[PDB]
């Protein structure tokens, strides 16, 4: 599925870039022009959310204590249910991705870099399994870039 593949492309690249401090220069797939604009957006908005909500993110990180792939697996099963409840908006979706980047930075600190790709997959699974129809209706990643346009 195309939407899953493009979402994972953006989400995995943003989480790994936040954790390592280096950009991925490997080519993107079809819709690469949109994925580059989505990453430019996440570098502005996602970095901003992590800074402005640092104390809440630290509290959530400390309580969840994600330190391995099994932790990511267990948490993704419950978060598919939690993320399905309540209103859907681009603010909620960028906060999920921003929290993923916050966790990815912590995983690099505890020498668990190998857990960033499964984390990006679970973030993508949570997002696409619960919001597929909303994402499609809101013009997908083009809609995301348009909503946060400066
Ligand atoms: C990849 C994986 C490791 C699986 C993963 C996936 C998701 C997350 N979650 C969820 C998404 N957020 S959010 O900040 O985007 N958004 C939220 C943050 C907070 C809240 S307040 C209410 C949560 C609560 O206390 N429920 C609660 C408390 C006790 C019992 C039952 C329910 C709700 C949301 C929201 O979107 O529903 C971050 C934390 C973490 C890790
Ligand atoms: C239900 C619906 C939306 C949110 C939410 C909104 C903004 C940022 C993070 C989560 C939480 C619970």
From Swiss-Prot:
Q: Which ranges belong to the motif BH1?
A: 81-101
- Cross-link Glycyl lysine isopeptide (Lys-Gly) (interchain with G-Cter in ubiquitin): residue positions: 23, 26
- What does the function comment of this entry state? Involved in the regulation of apoptosis versus cell survival, and in the maintenance of viability but not of proliferation. Mediates its effects by interactions with a number of other regulators of apoptosis. Isoform 1 inhibits apoptosis. Isoform 2 promotes apoptosis.
Q: What is this protein called?
A: Induced myeloid leukemia cell differentiation protein Mcl-1
**Upper taxonomic classification of the species?**
Eukaryota, Metazoa, Chordata, Craniata, Vertebrata
Q: How does it assemble?
A: Interacts with HIF3A (via C-terminus domain). Interacts with BAD, BOK, BIK and BMF. Interacts with PMAIP1. Interacts with BBC3. Isoform 1 interacts with BAX, BAK1 and TPT1. Heterodimer of isoform 1 and isoform 2. Homodimers of isoform 1 or isoform 2 are not detected. Isoform 2 does not interact with pro-apoptotic BCL2-related proteins. Interacts with RTL10/BOP. Interacts with BCL2L11; may sequester BCL2L11 to prevent its pro-apoptotic activity. Interacts with GIMAP5 and HSPA8/HSC70; the interaction between HSPA8 and MCL1 is impaired in the absence of GIMAP5.
* Consequence of changing residue 37 to R: No effect on ubiquitination
Query: What species is given as this protein's source?
Result: Homo sapiens (Human)
Induction of synthesis: Expression increases early during phorbol ester-induced differentiation along the monocyte/macrophage pathway in myeloid leukemia cell line ML-1. Rapidly up-regulated by CSF2 in ML-1 cells. Up-regulated by heat shock-induced differentiation. Expression increases early during retinoic acid-induced differentiation.
What gene does this protein come from?
MCL1
UniProt's post-translational modification comment states: Cleaved by CASP3 during apoptosis.
Motif BH3 extends across 38-52
* Cellular location(s): Membrane; Cytoplasm; Mitochondrion; Nucleus, Nucleoplasm
Q: Give, from the UniProt record, the effect of changing residue 23 to R.
A: Reduced ubiquitination
Motif extent (BH2): 133-148
